[PDB]
Amino acid sequence: AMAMSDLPIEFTELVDLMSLGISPQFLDFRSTTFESDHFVTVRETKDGTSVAIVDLAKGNEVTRKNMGGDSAIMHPSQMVISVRANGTIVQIFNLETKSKLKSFTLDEPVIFWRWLSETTLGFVTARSILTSNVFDGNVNAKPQLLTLRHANLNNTQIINFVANKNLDWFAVVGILQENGRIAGRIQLFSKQRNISQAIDGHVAIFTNILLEGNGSTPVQVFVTGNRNATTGAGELRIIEIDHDASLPSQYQKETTDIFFPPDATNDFPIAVQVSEKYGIIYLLTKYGFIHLYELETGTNLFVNRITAESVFTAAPYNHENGIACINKKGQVLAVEISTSQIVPYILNKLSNVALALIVATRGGLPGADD
């Protein structure tokens, strides 16, 4: 085990759900949902009839409400709950005003949903992908079709739906059993062209990076990670999307290994989150390994197994500067860079002054003034 003073990261437990009386029977992907580090929503059932909303921003205060619905998520930052029943009926409520933001019935059941932005909720059915601007005031409007699902997502469990800030690029992630392992399939979608591309991958996120020469204008990159179910080889890719011709500097595509030890045969990437501010990628595996990469270069900075209990969900942490996850024991664990230790770590453990400068300059971090 590595001591905290030696790490490039700060590692914390936000809450333990079992400590709060949550049964392990509900500590699973469909029951215990996590859109951001602000809230955890636990669906419980007893005698044929609830949600426990854990407010991580208010000392882990628990709000319990009975519900007729069978699935629920909280918004990333506001006291706004989205509930669905029988896959077709969806309602979204501001719990503070008790006001209904959205209320509609879909023609095809929702099988997956995820907040794409502060304004927009993403929905996936067996055949389609839709989005709703939940705050637009049009309570009874159904979500607008984004596109049909690609055939590559056929017979998958949909596990993520992400978008860029512009809400014109999207990725939907599904997994399936193959070769005794879990393979990942991603449908990438450009709304501008209304065209999809199918790729292999278990995790996906869109982010932005400020490059020298481009002034204050960021370029957009898509970050994706895969473990090949046939070979067992892991790979992270970072690629530019929609390069603005007015900008002189381009982002060169980066590809880096995702290491898996010989005894982690059936592990795979389960989450990826990125700090735009620091240019740091956080990749988490199902078996609890954290992998940090520098965003500009794709360089691997750090690998450590932060938990031995399997992870089932994750989300952004600390104003999207880190990653948080939930393990099978209901531990909500958080990793972010250590602002005081990361630069010294790169200088001393990685022995790389140039990389240390990249990180320190982008993040405004101490350690490389000399």
Partner: peptide, 7 residues
């Protein structure tokens, strides 16, 4: 069906 991600 059982959730794959929870296996």
């Amino acid at each position: 069906g059982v959730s794959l991600i929870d296996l």
